[PDB]
Structures are given as structure tokens and as C-alpha cells.
Design a protein around this ligand. Structure first.
Ligand SMILES: CCCCCCCCCCCCCCCCCC(=O)OC[C@H](COP(=O)(O)OCCN)OC(=O)CCCCCCCCCCCCCCCCC
Ligand SMILES: CCCCCCCCCCCCCCCCCC(=O)OC[C@H](COP(=O)(O)OCCN)OC(=O)CCCCCCCCCCCCCCCCC
Ligand SMILES: CCCCCCCCCCCCCCCCCC(=O)OC[C@H](COP(=O)(O)OCCN)OC(=O)CCCCCCCCCCCCCCCCC
Ligand SMILES: CCCCCCCCCCCCCCCCCC(=O)OC[C@H](COP(=O)(O)OCCN)OC(=O)CCCCCCCCCCCCCCCCC
Ligand SMILES: CCCCCCCCCCCC(=O)OC[C@H](COP(=O)(O)OCC[N+](C)(C)C)OC(=O)CCCCCCCCCCC
Ligand SMILES: CCCCCCCCCCCCO[C@H]1O[C@H](CO)[C@@H](O[C@H]2O[C@@H](CO)[C@H](O)[C@H](O)[C@@H]2O)[C@H](O)[C@H]1O
Lengths: 93, 185, 341, 68, 57, 86, 128, 78, 171, 68, 89
């Protein structure tokens, strides 16, 4: 379960403005400004299909890209494992 | 500055409630064992508080040092499946859990007093208001501590229970070999 | 409480820097035994090698693998280090010169040493690997198996002095050090010390596991520094146990004659020189025991798990269950059961 | 067997009351055993301090409401 | 033929002393310690070079 | 002994622990007032030390050899009122 | 505030110093295979445990009673003078009874690891 | 096999020789453990008779006299 | 009784003793001089001490209120002993208890001052140190010539005084 | 020879300036006669003492701090 | 008195209403013994009595042997079955 918060603008923008004082990259205030600016595609501009290219889209590649962070907690429904497990040796004498 | 350390018994009671809840609640039983270790630490603290640090150290070296070690030893070696604490599985227990909590706690606090009327038996248990005076005597000439006296009574006045605990420990050796080992012939 | 903070900081500084230079001592002594020299280049005469190692490690990533656990991997070093360092509270460098002058000091030592097994236990749980969980088991078996021998020697010594105050155990050895009547117990306690520290010839699972992909401590960064500090502090603390149980701790020749010659009344120079002599004795004994650890690493091959468990449970404990019978019998024969203090 | 022994190896806090009560039991039979009621009350009072607690409750209440 | 415990030119107590007191092991410790007091072979390389021959490639 | 470079770290360990023990001896003596530490103290010695604190003006381990106490020692007595254990 | 208390609290609530120094100073930009674990190696959804020999768990199960024995000897060594020549005999009987179990442990060979693939020791006999 | 057990009941002395040669870790533990109780039984009275007797007891408490009170004076008031 | 536990506030009492109880001086000596004068107190206050304990035992509970006269006698006898020490034998006494302070109140570290003090009190006050309960066969440990247990540093002033007293035949 | 008398004797032969230079450069204290100098400025030495082992008799003292 | 009764009662409830583990059952038994020992030792201190501390150290020993035997029995159960499941003991 990915955690998200959704707290207001005047607070997050100030928190970001504060975290620019550390040396490493952080979420910038202009990024939370861009959080209100959705993509407006220019129709006069060329596209992929002018290059004979057909993109992938995100849901088919999300598996490939996110499976390193998949935990894979345990196996599914270990019931129906009892009587087969009964036939193996578990402590060697 | 004086009363900064007054509520250190109440804090241990609170932390014990918390650690028991975490034992019941933890997903992986390894975490339940670790919270049991934390509860042993809290009990050892409380025992130092009331003046029995010898028992605190005995607890640290026996319970945490051997029993918890053996618990971790077995869960590292055995497959112990677990169902997570759920609302579709455990919420049915709440009425009986609450009834039993109230009844068992109140009876456990009533059982310690000898008063005839039942309500007063709880009210005396909560009558922890007045402090104890600690006066000093000069009659104890030796350096006898709690462990010395335990040894004295256990080896003279109570030698029989020691020489029966010997057979209990013999069982602790002979049973596990009979149950775990397979003798060839 | 100002001077309490001062005493604590002095003690901490001296202990931790002793550890950091024991690393260099290990390397240089093993080297000169091996007809080489090293480290001699990273300070003048090699006296900044450990600090270079520390500074490097404290700038490395703290990579934690995919199927591992963050919290356990990160705190197990820290719990191990805490337990290694809080055992120094009861160690006396003089008659009462201690941070913790507990009358239950032996039991504090013996109970805080009981918690060092949890590091090796929890290390195995920081991965979804089934064979490291067995290396964990083998190591913990070794540690719990030699704990019994250390505790047995503790109790055999306390048969001679009926006290758990470490300063009293030392002051009883003004007459004779307990290595003289119990010289084989010195060998046994050193052997069990080397085995509890998981040091060679008892380095089975570290040696075992560097072969395989797992079953050893594959930590990076700060966990790694903490584990090194824990190891090279437990070495000094188990040699300290050797010291105050069998080698007299801080004791030496009687210097009453010399002090009555040099001095005429108690001054602070008198007290400083007393303290320096006593802690000098304690430190030279510790140095000898650390050199012995290094020597044993240099000399002998390694054990297997079977040979080691057999060694312990079939050779050493029988002798000690016999010594439990022979020491009180020797005290009964001569009417020498010891009094409290 | 370990009755009447302290944590320090000696007589416990409420030894004397117990010993008085046991002297009176040794004097008595099961029909004259009711003579030993005040002694047993004393032993239990030493143990649990009920009457002294009620006394101090009265003292405190006089310090409590008759003033404020 | 193998030699049994009988037909032994060494008493039980003597070999038990060698068993309990770790004779050969102390001898090995001493042979390692003798090297501690011998000259190290190490040459400091950027400032002292090793042996080279005319044939070197 | 020949290899001094190998004994230098041992010398540092020796010197640090020695100086630590010496400074700790001095600090303990400063804390006590020119007297070595007490150790292995039982109940009796603790009660006697409290009595000494009653006979001197709270001046730690200062000892008094006079045969009659000040008249403050009659009213300086301490009883300890302990929390209820639960 | 005693120096004992100061030390034993200070060690835990300060031990994370170099931890934080390392977390703030050091790089952290993981890969998939830097989050990986080995040169080669794999395992399907076969099981969560490996079969182990009995001695591996028996050493731990027997650590408890022998440890309790040696810890029960502590009252004796702290009472040795007061229990003069009576408790001595009692603890000797204690130790003998507990040595009987140790004898049992040795004679059963409970901590020994046994080997399955024996070497063949049977003669080669040819039916004529 | 080479040096198998000959049995204690088929000869004690031979068995003990075999044990010293082939099982020293058990034999000498047995010797240590047995030599304490036996020595305690057999040598202690010789020690009491010919070396030094047992020490007189320590007080262990205030030695309250077993007598009736006696009237005293000295160090009374005034 | 047990020592306090988990919290405890000292509290004094500014009340005076009742008037049916006469006044009595206190002893006023701290740990070390009292440890030095213990045996000389016991040599002189045996009857008063044991009468105090016998009236406590006979009282069977009321010893605090029934034994006041007897305890006053004990206190006065001890004060008399320490007054006699201070009037006559103060330098050796001070040697002894300062020596006790620099040790851990171990009498084994103070024998050279103990000898001088015992000689002084035996000659002037006629009180001698005796460890009872022993046999004629047992050697009292404070008279052993060469003990096993000796101090780390023998006290300086006591050593100089012992030397001077052996050169002047006082011992 | 790995002994202290060696470094003390050599540091008496080569003065303290050379001692600190050698300690900052080589890490060891060596005393030898100057054999020559190269075109870059590096000075080359040879020792005759029995203490120095085979292959430790000839050495270099570089001119640059960033030696190579 | 309070800490012990609380630990005991909560351990008993976590034993009774455990639909998850067997390890929790072991833990709840051990914590129940702990709670009893704490009440026992508090009474030992208040009465200034040794019988309570004697009973407590005896409980320590007996609980250790109990743990050893219980975890041998679990190992036999696992010898035969190979998996210790949510249910079925
Ligand atoms: C965490 C669990 C607590 C473990 C308790 C450890 C312990 O028992 O220490 C004893 C205590 C003092 O006991 P004691 O030796 O008699 O008094 C010396 C005064 N410095 O040690 C202490 O001085 C304080 C204990 C703080 C905990
Ligand atoms: C410790 C107590 C000392 C025990 C002495 C001992 O180990 O006895 C050894 C003895 C075997 O000695 P053995 O091989 O027969 O002859 C050697 C002669 N140099 O063993 C025996 O012969 C049996 C003696 C049993 C007593
Ligand atoms: C500087 C420090 C010096 C010490 C460094 C030692 C480092 C670690 C030593 C490792 C132990 C050696 C070893 O490998 O032990 C295993 C070995 C197994 O052999 P085993 O199964 O018993 O076969 C018997 C038939 N040969 O079995 C053995 O050989 C174990 C030998 C005993 C271990 C030493 C015991 C010391 C205590 C002496 C007790 C003396 C009293 C007993 C009676 C003595 C009679 C002479
Ligand atoms: C002077 C004479 C001293 C007497 C010497 C006694 C000789 C002992 C003989 C011996 O070595 O025991 C061998 C015996 C079997 O060994 P083995 O054939 O190799 O088979 C084992 C695996 N199946 O081994 C065994 O049966 C196990 C023996 C275990 C001994 C280890 C514990 C030592 C205990 C010391 C205390 C001694 C007192 C014990 C008596 C108890 C009485 C209640
Ligand atoms: C530290 C001060 C500093 O700033 O460092 C200064 C120097 C530089 O260190 P170095 O270059 O590695 O040593 C030089 C050795 N060589 C060629 C052989 C690299 O320290 C030292 O030599 C050691 C400082 C004294 C050690 C104290 C113990
Ligand atoms: C504790 C201070 C805080 C900072 C941490 C310092 C970390 C530095 C730890 C080093 C301690 C010595 O530990 C190290 O010893 C030697 C160094 O030659 C290594 O040994 C290595 O070198 C060779 C020697 O040529 C050995 O033969 C061995 O085969 C191995 O290859 C050990 O495998 C390692 O354990």
C-alpha cells in the first residue's frame, strides 16, 4: 500500500522551500507548483508516428519496472500441502 | 527533582500492557518473541525498582539468555505458518474478551483481601495511598543478601526440593533425547 | 555530576581507542609472525590505519538487499555493540576504581554476556535465505555451548571467594592469583573465550560462509564498523574476565616498601602513582592475552562444527563437573570454606 | 520449613505476632481455640495494615473536609 | 600390522599429559613466535625495487 | 623485543588504559576528599555512612572523633517514607 | 544520577551516532542487482525450511537444563560458609544425580552427527 | 575393530588401562570427580587429628546470655 | 528491616522527647573512630550492653519504651570510654582511624597503629583487646607476626611511629 | 633488522631533517651513501650495514612529493 | 500485584483467543509464569520473607524445564508432519 497524504499547498511549498537548504536533491517548490499544471499538448507539433514509432504504455511495463520492489511475502494457500509434506523427511536421524 | 522518578512503577505497568498487546498483535512470531524479551526487560526493571536486582539479573541470564534463545532457535528451524490478526477472524471475540477482562481482573484484585462484603474487597485492593516507613535496625551483623539466604534455606531447610529439582532436570535431559533422537538398536 | 561525566568520557575514549589500535596490533603482530610488516603506511608507523578504515566505511552506501529486512540488519550491530560496551561498566582498574561498583558485578557480566548470542541469531533473519538461517543456528549453538564452560569457571572461582564483587575477587588474590591453584582452568577459560568470540580456530561460520553466497555477515557501511567494534571490544572484555578471575586483575608486587621510601604522607601524586601502577598491571595482562588471541590465530588450523561440539560437550564439561566435586572437597578437607567478603 | 526467615536470614517482619499466636494455639484445644482471635487479628494486621489504613483515612478526612 | 593400545612403548599417563597439555600445539606456537624475532622480508616498493635481470621482458 | 613497530599499538593501548586508571583514581579521591574509595559495602556501612552525614554537616566522609555529639544530632534523624509497591 | 546509570543509558541513546553520520554522509542510489544477493543462485516456491539433524536442536534443548544446573549452583557458592558440611554433602548429591544424566547423554551419543552414505565394508563373494 | 571395548566385567584393571589409553577425557574426569568425596570421607579425620582441628564457630548474631538479669549501677542519671 | 525501594523522601521530626524521659548525651563519633574503639567499649560495657539486650528480650515487644534507662547507661559508658581516649590517647587513636579511612575499614591494614593504641589503652586505662570464642590453641589474627593478608600501602605515619616506638622501647 | 637501535642509529647518522623526510616518504629510516642523482632530480643511495636485508640495500629519495 | 495480574490476564486471553500460532501459546504460558513470579516477589518484599523468593527461583527452574520439554514435543510433531499450521495445535 503506497502511502500518500494530500496536505495543502501553502504548507508543502514551504516545506520544500526549506528542504532546499540541505545539499542533496529534494522535491522543489516549483514541482508542487507544476502539480497544478496538467499536460497541454500542442497539436501543431509532430509526434511519434511521424517517426514510424509506436510507444509502449505504462501498465504493460509497470511489472518489469516495479518487480524489484515486490516483496513476494509467501506462497498461496499452503492448505493441500499437508499430506504431501507428510511423505518427506524433515529431521535426519 | 525529587518526584521525577515517582511514577516509574506505573510506567512499567503501562509498558507491560503495551508489550503484551504487541505480542498478541505482531505479524511474524519472531517479533512476538522479541516483544516477550522486552516484557522480560520491563519485569526485570520493576524487580530492580522494588529492590530485587538479583532476580532481575537472574531473569536476564535465564529467561532472555536461554529460553528466548531456544524460541528463536526453533522458529529459525521450523516452518510455523501464521494467520494475521484480522477483523473477519478475531472481532467475534470482543464480547467475551471484554467480559472476561472485567471479570478476571476484578476477581484477581478481590481475591487478595479477607473482607466479607464483595465490593469492599476491590476497594481495599485499590487502597494504595499511604506510604511505608523504613526504620533502621542494627541487629544484622553479617552481609547476608537474598541469594545467600536462598542458598542457606535451599541447601539446609529445603534440601529435599533441591534434590527433587535434580530429577526434574534429569527429565529435562532424558525426555528430549527420547522424543527427538531415534535409537538404532 | 560534572566529574562523573569526565570519568565516563575518559573511560569511553580510552576503551574505544584501545579497540581501534587493537585492530592495528592484530595486523602488525600477525604480520611480523608471518615474516612481513603491515600496516605501516597510512599514518606514521601505521597509527591511523583503523581511522582510515572507519572513515571509508562511514562514507559507503548502506545497501540493504531486496529480500532482506531493514530494521533488523541495522540494529543487530547496534544491540551487539551496546551489550559489548555496557559490560565494561563493572571492570575495575583499581580498588574500587570502577564506573559500576556493583556487589553483583559477576552476575552483571555473566548476564550481559548472555545477550551477545542474539546478534548471531538475528543476523540470519535479515534475508529470505534458508541456508543462512542454518549458519545462524550453528553459530548460536557454539556460543551457547561455550557459555556453560565460562559460567562453570566463574562458579569454581566463586567457590574460593563467596562474593560477586569484582574488586573483592581481585583483592582476595593478594595472597595468590587463582591461575596458580587452577592453572588448567586458565587454559580452559582462554579456549572458551576464543570460542565465544567466534575467533580462529573457532571461526567456522565466517569461514564456512565466505565460501557460499550467504551465511556470514554481509554488512556494509556503519553496521560493519559497529560489528568490528563489538568483536574487538568483546575480545578485550573476555580477556578482562580472564584477568580478574585468574590473573589478579590490577595486582602486582607489593609496593608498600617503595611507597614508604618515596613518600611521607598521602598526596595526590601518591594516589596517581598507585593508580598508574595498578592499571599498568591490568593493562599488561590484557596486552598479553590479546597477543595470545593473535598468536592462536597465527598458529593453528580451523575446527569443524562436529569436532567443536564434541570438544565442548564430551571433553570439557566432564572435567568441570568433576572439578565442581573436587574443589569443595578440598575446602572441606582443610576447613577453608570462605566467608562473605 | 523456611517459615519465619527473612531476606537477610533472620526473623521476618511479622514474626512476633505469629509466635504469640502459635504459643496461644499450643496452649489451647479446638474448643478453646477462639481465645486466639486477638492474636490472629494482630498477625493479620501486621501483615496487611488494614486497620491502620482506615485510621489514617479518618485522620486525612478530618484534615480534608473539616478545613476546606 | 596396526599397533593396538597394548604393545605400546608409552604409558597412559604420559600420553594423557601430552593430550591435556597440548604439547605439539605449544611447540607450533613457539615456532611461530620464533619468526616474530626474525627479520621481515618486506621491501618498500616505490622506494626500493625488486630483482630484475637482463633477460626481463 | 625486536619488532618495535608491532609493539607501538600495544604501547598505546597500555598507555591509554594506564592513564585512564590513574585519572580515575585521582577523580575518585577528589570526589571522596583525600580518601580512597569504599567497596563491598553492606547495609551496615551504608547506615553508618548516613550516621556520619548526620554528625558532620553533610560533609561526605568527614570523620569526627569527639565523644559527645552536637545537639542537632538529636533532631537530625531521618526516617524514609516509601511509595506503595504495586 | 550515578556514573553507572549515566553510562548504561548513554550507550543506547548515543549508539546511533555513527549510524546517522553514515546515513547522512554516504551515497544511496540502489540498483536491482545491487539489491540482489549472490553470484548465482535461485529457488522456486518449494519450501520455507531445510531438513536438519537432531543434534542441531538437541544442543539448544540441552543447554537449558545444564545452564539451570550451573545457575542453581550460585546459591551454594554464596552460602558455602553458612551451610558448612551439610549443604556440601547436599550439593554433592545434587551434582552426582545431575552427572547421571550427563552419563546418559554421553552413552546415547545424542550430539553426534550420523552419516547416511556409509562406506561399503562387506566382502566380495562370487557364486561359483 | 582395532581397540574396541573389552568390558569392565571381563576384567577391571585391563578395562581401566584401556580407558586411560583410549578414553582419557572420561577416565581422568572420573578420577577427578571420585577423588573429592573419597578424600573427604577418608582424609578429613586424619587432618583433624594430626594437622589442626576445625575452627570455633563465628558469632552470627548478638550472643544473648542465658541468664536472669542482675541489678547494676554506675552511669545512672544526675 | 529492608532498605527503601523505588521512591523514598527523607523526613525529619522537630519534636522533643517527652519530659518523663531524662536527657542523655549522644556518642558523636563517626564510623572509623568507633570501629577503633569497639573493643575497648566492649571491654567496659559488657554488663550494661547485655542488660540492655536482656531487658529488650524480656519486654517482648515494648523494648523501645521499656529499655530507655538501660540504653542511657550504655550510651554513657561509651561516651566515657571515648572521653578517656580523647583525654589521654588521642594521637594513636587518630593514627588508627585515619588509617582505617584510607583503607576500606579493614583492620588488617592498620596493625601498626593498632599495636600502639592497644599498648596505650592497656597501660593507661587498663582495657585490653580480646577476641572471644577462641580456644587456647588458636592465634588471634591481630597478634599474628607475618599474616597472609597485608595492606597495599602501609600507612606512612603509622610506620614512622612504629619505628620510633621500637627505637624508644615503648613496644 | 626491525629493531629500534637501527632507526635510532640511522637517525643519528642522517639528521632530523632527513628523518622527517623519510618518515613522510618511505615510512622507514635508512642511512646510506649517496651514489648519484638522475636528470629528474631523484637521489640514489646504497647501504653497507649488515642490518639491511637482501634487496633493501639500494633505495631512492624522490624529488617530487607526488612520487612515481 | 497490578503488573503481575495484568500480564497474567492478558497472557491468558492471548492464549485463549489465539487463532494464529503455537508460538503465541508458548509465549503466553511463559508470560503467565512471569506474572505469578512478580506478584510473588512483591509479596516477598513486603512481608520480608524468603519462602516467596524460594518458590520464585523454583518456578524459574521448572519453567525452563517446561520450555525444553514443550519444544521437544513440538519437534516430534514436526518430525512427522513437516509444517506447524495455523490450527491443529
Ligand atoms: C534493565 C534491567 C535492570 C537490571 C538491574 C541491574 C542491577 O541489578 O543492578 C543493581 C543496581 C545497584 O545494586 P547495588 O550493587 O547493591 O548498589 C550499588 C550502588 N552503586 O545497579 C545500579 O546501581 C542501578 C541500576 C539501574 C538499572
Ligand atoms: C588422577 C589420578 C591418577 C591416575 C593414574 C593413572 O592414570 O593410572 C594409569 C594406569 C595405566 O598405567 P599403565 O599403562 O598400565 O603403565 C604405565 C607405567 N609407566 O591405569 C591403571 O593401570 C588402572 C589404575 C586405576 C586406579
Ligand atoms: C597461548 C594459549 C595456549 C592454548 C591455545 C589452545 C588453542 C585451542 C586448542 C584447541 C583444542 C585441541 C583440539 O583439537 O581438541 C580436540 C581433541 C579431539 O580428539 P579426541 O576426540 O578426544 O580423540 C582422542 C584420541 N586421540 O581433543 C583434545 O585434544 C582436547 C585436549 C584437552 C583440552 C585442554 C584441556 C586443558 C585442561 C587440562 C586439565 C588437566 C587435568 C586432567 C587430568 C590431567 C592428567 C595428566
Ligand atoms: C582411579 C580410578 C578412577 C575410575 C575411572 C573410571 C573409568 C571410566 C571408564 C571410561 O572411560 O568410561 C567409558 C564409558 C564408555 O565409553 P565408550 O565405550 O567409548 O562408549 C561411549 C559411546 N557409546 O563411558 C561412559 O559410560 C560415560 C561416562 C561419562 C563420564 C563423564 C562424567 C564425569 C563425571 C565425574 C564424576 C564421577 C562420579 C560419578 C559417579 C556417580 C555416582 C552416582
Ligand atoms: C593527524 C594530522 C593530519 O592531518 O595528518 C598528518 C599526517 C599525514 O598522514 P599520512 O599521509 O597518511 O602519513 C604519512 C605516512 N606515509 C608516506 C608513510 C604516507 O598524519 C600522520 O602521518 C600521522 C599523525 C601522527 C600519528 C598519531 C598517532
Ligand atoms: C574497530 C575500529 C573501527 C574501525 C574498523 C576497522 C576495520 C579494520 C578491521 C581489520 C582487522 C584485521 O582483520 C583483517 O586481518 C587481516 C589483514 O591482513 C585479514 O587477512 C587477510 O590478509 C592475509 C594476509 O596477507 C591473510 O593471510 C588472510 O588470508 C586474509 O587474506 C583478515 O581477513 C581480516 O580479518
Amino acid at each position: 500500500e503506497v502511502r500518500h497524504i494530500e496536505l495543502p499547498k501553502a504548507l508543502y511549498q514551504a516545506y520544500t522551500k526549506a528542504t532546499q537548504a540541505i545539499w542533496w536533491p529534494t522535491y522543489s517548490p516549483d514541482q508542487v507548483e507544476r502539480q497544478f499544471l496538467s499536460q497541454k499538448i500542442d497539436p501543431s507539433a509532430k509526434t511519434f508516428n511521424d517517426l514510424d514509432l509506436t510507444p509502449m504504455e505504462l501498465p504493460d511495463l509497470m511489472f518489469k519496472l516495479i518487480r524489484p520492489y515486490r516483496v513476494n511475502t509467501f506462497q498461496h494457500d499452503v492448505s493441500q500441502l499437508e499430506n504431501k509434506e507428510k511423505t518427506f523427511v524433515h529431521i535426519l536421524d | 527533582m525529587m518526584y521525577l522518578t515517582y511514577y516509574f512503577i506505573e510506567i512499567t505497568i503501562f509498558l507491560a500492557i503495551l508489550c503484551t498487546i504487541f505480542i498478541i498483535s505482531a505479524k511474524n512470531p519472531m517479533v512476538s518473541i522479541l516483544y516477550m524479551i522486552a516484557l522480560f526487560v520491563i519485569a526485570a526493571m520493576y524487580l530492580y525498582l522494588i529492590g530485587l536486582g538479583i532476580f532481575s539479573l537472574l531473569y536476564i541470564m535465564i529467561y532472555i539468555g536461554a529460553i528466548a534463545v531456544l524460541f528463536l532457535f526453533i522458529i529459525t528451524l521450523l516452518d510455523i505458518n501464521s494467520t494475521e490478526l484480522s477483523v473477519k477472524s478475531n472481532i467475534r471475540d470482543l464480547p467475551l474478551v471484554l467480559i472476561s477482562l472485567i471479570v478476571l481482573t476484578i476477581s484477581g484484585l478481590m481475591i487478595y483481601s479477607n473482607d466479607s462484603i464483595l465490593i469492599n474487597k476491590l476497594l481495599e485492593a485499590f487502597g494504595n495511598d499511604y506510604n511505608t516507613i523504613i526504620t533502621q535496625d542494627w541487629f544484622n551483623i553479617e552481609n547476608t543478601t537474598l541469594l545467600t539466604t536462598i542458598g542457606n534455606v535451599l541447601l539446609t531447610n529445603n534440601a529435599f526440593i533441591l534434590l527433587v529439582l535434580a530429577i526434574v532436570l534429569l527429565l529435562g535431559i532424558i525426555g528430549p533425547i527420547s522424543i527427538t533422537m531415534k535409537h538404532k538398536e | 555530576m560534572i566529574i562523573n561525566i569526565v570519568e565516563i568520557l575518559i573511560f569511553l575514549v580510552c576503551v574505544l581507542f584501545s579497540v581501534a589500535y587493537l585492530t592495528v596490533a592484530e595486523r602488525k603482530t600477525l604480520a611480523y609472525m608471518q615474516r612481513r610488516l603491515g600496516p605501516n603506511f597510512v599514518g606514521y608507523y601505521g597509527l591511523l590505519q583503523a581511522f582510515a578504515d572507519a572513515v571509508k566505511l562511514l562514507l559507503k552506501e548502506i545497501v540493504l538487499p531486496k529480500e532482506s529486512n531493514y530494521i533488523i540488519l541495522v540494529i543487530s550491530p547496534l544491540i551487539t555493540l551496546i551489550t559489548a560496551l555496557i559490560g565494561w561498566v563493572v571492570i575495575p582498574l583499581g580498588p574500587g576504581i570502577t564506573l559500576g561498583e556493583l556487589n553483583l558485578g559477576i552476575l552483571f557480566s555473566l548476564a550481559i554476556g548472555s545477550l551477545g548470542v542474539f546478534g548471531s541469531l538475528l543476523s540470519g533473519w535479515s534475508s529470505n535465505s534458508k541456508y543462512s538461517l542454518l549458519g545462524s543456528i550453528r553459530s548460536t549453538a557454539q556460543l551457547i555451548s561455550y557459555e556453560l564452560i565460562l559460567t562453570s569457571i566463574f562458579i569454581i572461582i566463586i567457590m574460593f571467594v563467596s562474593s560477586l564483587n569484582i574488586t573483592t575477587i581481585i583483592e582476595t588474590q593478594r595472597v595468590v592469583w587463582y591461575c596458580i591453584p587452577l592453572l588448567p582452568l586458565l587454559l580452559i577459560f582462554f579456549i572458551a573465550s576464543v570460542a565465544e568470540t567466534a575467533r580462529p580456530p573457532f571461526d567456522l561460520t565466517e569461514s564456512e560462509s565466505e565460501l557460499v553466497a550467504g551465511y556470514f555477515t554481509e554488512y556494509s557501511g556503519s553496521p560493519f564498523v559497529f560489528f568490528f567494534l563489538a568483536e574487538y571490544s568483546n575480545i578485550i572484555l573476555i580477556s578482562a574476565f580472564n584477568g580478574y578471575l585468574l590473573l589478579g586483575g590490577y595486582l602486582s608486587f607489593n609496593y608498600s616498601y617503595l611507597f614508604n621510601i618515596l613518600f611521607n604522607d598521602y598526596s595526590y601524586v601518591s594516589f596517581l602513582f598507585e593508580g598508574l601502577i595498578n592499571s599498568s598491571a591490568y593493562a599488561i595482562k590484557l596486552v598479553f592475552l590479546m597477543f595470545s588471541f593473535i598468536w592462536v590465530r597465527a598458529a593453528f588450523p580451523r575446527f569443524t562444527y562436529d569436532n567443536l561440539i564434541n570438544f565442548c560437550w564430551i571433553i570439557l564439561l566432564p572435567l568441570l563437573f568433576g572439578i565442581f566435586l573436587i574443589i569443595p572437597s578440598t575446602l572441606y578437607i582443610f576447613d577453608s570454606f570462605p566467608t562473605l567478603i | 520449613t523456611a517459615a519465619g526467615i527473612s531476606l537477610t536470614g533472620g526473623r521476618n517482619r511479622c514474626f512476633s505476632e505469629w509466635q504469640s499466636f502459635m504459643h496461644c494455639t499450643a496452649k489451647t484445644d479446638a474448643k478453646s481455640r477462639a481465645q486466639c482471635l486477638p492474636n490472629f487479628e494482630d498477625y493479620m494486621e501486621c501483615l496487611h495494615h488494614t486497620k491502620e489504613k482506615a485510621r489514617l483515612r479518618e485522620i486525612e478526612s478530618v484534615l480534608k473536609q473539616k478545613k476546606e | 600390522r596396526p599397533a593396538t593400545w597394548e604393545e605400546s612403548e608409552e604409558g597412559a599417563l604420559s600420553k594423557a599429559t601430552k593430550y591435556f597439555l597440548l604439547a605439539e600445539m605449544f611447540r607450533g606456537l613457539y615456532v611461530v613466535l620464533e619468526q616474530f624475532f626474525r627479520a621481515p622480508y618486506t621491501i618498500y616498493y616505490p622506494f626500493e625495487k625488486g630483482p630484475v635481470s637482463p633477460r626481463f621482458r | 623485543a625486536i619488532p618495535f613497530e608491532a609493539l607501538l599499538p600495544y604501547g598505546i593501548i597500555f598507555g591509554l588504559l594506564t592513564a585512564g586508571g590513574g585519572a580515575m583514581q585521582v577523580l575518585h579521591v577528589y570526589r571522596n576528599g583525600g580518601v580512597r574509595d569504599r567497596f563491598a559495602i553492606d547495609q551496615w556501612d551504608s547506615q553508618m555512612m548516613e550516621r556520619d552525614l548526620r554528625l558532620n554537616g553533610g560533609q561526605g566522609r568527614k570523620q569526627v572523633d569527639q565523644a559527645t555529639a552536637p545537639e542537632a544530632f538529636k533532631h537530625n534523624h531521618v526516617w524514609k517514607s516509601e511509595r506503595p509497591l504495586i | 544520577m550515578n556514573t553507572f546509570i549515566i553510562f548504561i543509558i548513554l550507550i543506547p541513546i548515543v549508539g546511533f551516532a555513527l549510524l546517522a553520520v553514515n546515513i547522512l554522509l554516504a551515497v544511496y542510489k540502489p540498483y536491482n542487482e545491487k539489491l540482489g544477493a549472490f553470484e548465482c543462485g535461485l529457488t522456486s516456491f518449494n519450501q520455507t525450511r531445510l531438513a536438519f539433524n537432531a543434534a542441531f536442536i538437541l544442543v539448544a534443548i540441552l543447554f537449558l537444563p545444564f545452564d539451570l544446573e550451573i545457575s542453581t549452583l550460585l546459591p551454594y557458592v554464596m552460602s558455602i560458609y553458612l551451610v558448612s558440611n551439610y549443604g556440601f554433602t547436599i550439593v554433592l548429591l545434587f551434582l552426582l544425580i545431575l552427572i547421571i544424566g550427563f552419563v546418559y547423554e554421553i552413552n546415547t551419543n545424542a550430539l553426534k552427527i550420523n552419516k547416511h552414505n556409509k562406506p561399503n565394508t562387506d566382502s566380495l563373494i562370487y557364486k561359483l | 575393530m582395532i581397540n574396541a571395548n573389552p568390558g569392565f566385567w571381563n576384567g577391571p584393571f585391563r578395562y581401566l588401562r584401556w580407558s586411560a589409553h583410549n578414553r582419557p577425557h572420561l577416565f581422568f574426569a572420573f578420577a577427578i570427580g571420585i577423588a573429592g568425596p573419597v578424600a573427604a570421607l577418608t582424609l578429613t579425620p586424619l587432618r583433624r587429628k594430626y594437622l589442626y582441628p576445625d575452627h570455633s564457630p563465628l558469632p552470627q548474631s548478638y550472643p544473648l546470655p542465658q541468664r536472669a538479669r542482675e541489678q547494676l549501677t554506675g552511669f545512672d542519671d544526675e | 528491616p529492608r532498605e527503601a525501594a523505588a521512591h523514598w523522601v527523607p523526613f525529619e521530626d522537630k519534636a522533643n522527647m517527652p519530659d518523663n524521659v531524662p536527657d542523655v548525651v549522644e556518642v558523636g563519633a563517626t564510623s572509623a573512630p568507633l570501629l577503633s574503639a569497639s573493643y575497648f567499649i566492649g571491654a567496659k560495657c559488657k554488663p550494661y550492653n547485655d542488660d540492655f539486650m536482656l531487658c529488650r528480650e524480656e519486654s517482648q515487644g515494648s523494648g523501645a519504651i521499656d529499655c530507655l534507662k538501660e540504653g542511657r547507661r550504655v550510651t554513657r559508658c561509651a561516651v566515657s570510654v571515648i572521653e578517656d581516649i580523647n583525654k589521654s590517647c588521642l594521637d594513636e587513636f587518630r593514627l588508627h582511624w585515619q588509617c582505617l579511612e584510607q583503607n576500606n575499614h579493614q583492620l588488617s591494614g592498620c596493625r601498626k597503629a593498632e599495636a600502639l593504641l592497644n599498648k596505650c589503652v592497656f597501660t593507661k586505662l587498663n582495657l585490653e583487646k580480646k577476641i572471644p570464642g577462641l580456644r587456647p590453641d588458636e592465634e588471634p589474627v591481630f597478634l599474628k607476626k607475618d599474616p597472609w593478608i597485608k595492606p597495599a600501602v602501609d600507612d606512612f605515619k603509622s610506620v614512622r611511629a612504629y619505628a620510633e616506638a621500637k627505637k624508644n622501647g615503648t613496644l | 633488522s626491525s629493531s629500534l637501535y637501527r632507526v635510532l642509529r640511522n637517525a643519528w647518522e642522517v639528521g632530523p631533517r632527513s628523518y622527517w623526510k623519510q618518515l613522510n616518504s618511505i615510512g622507514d629510516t635508512k642511512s646510506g651513501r649517496l651514489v648519484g642523482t638522475d636528470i629528474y632530480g631523484n637521489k640514489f643511495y646504497e647501504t653497507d650495514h649488515q642490518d639491511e636485508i637482501h634487496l633493501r640495500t639500494r633505495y631512492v629519495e624522490y624529488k617530487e612529493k607526488d612520487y612515481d | 500485584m497490578f503488573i503481575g495480574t495484568i500480564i497474567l490476564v492478558l497472557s491468558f486471553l492471548g492464549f485463549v483467543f489465539n487463532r494464529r500460532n503455537i508460538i503465541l501459546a508458548f509465549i503466553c504460558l511463559e508470560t503467565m509464569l512471569l506474572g505469578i513470579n512478580l506478584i510473588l516477589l512483591r509479596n516477598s518484599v513486603l512481608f520480608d520473607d524468603i519462602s516467596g523468593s524460594l518458590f520464585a527461583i523454583v518456578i524459574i527452574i521448572l519453567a525452563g524445564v517446561e520450555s525444553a520439554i514443550g519444544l521437544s514435543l513440538l519437534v516430534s510433531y514436526y518430525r512427522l508432519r513437516g509444517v506447524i499450521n495455523s490450527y491443529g495445535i
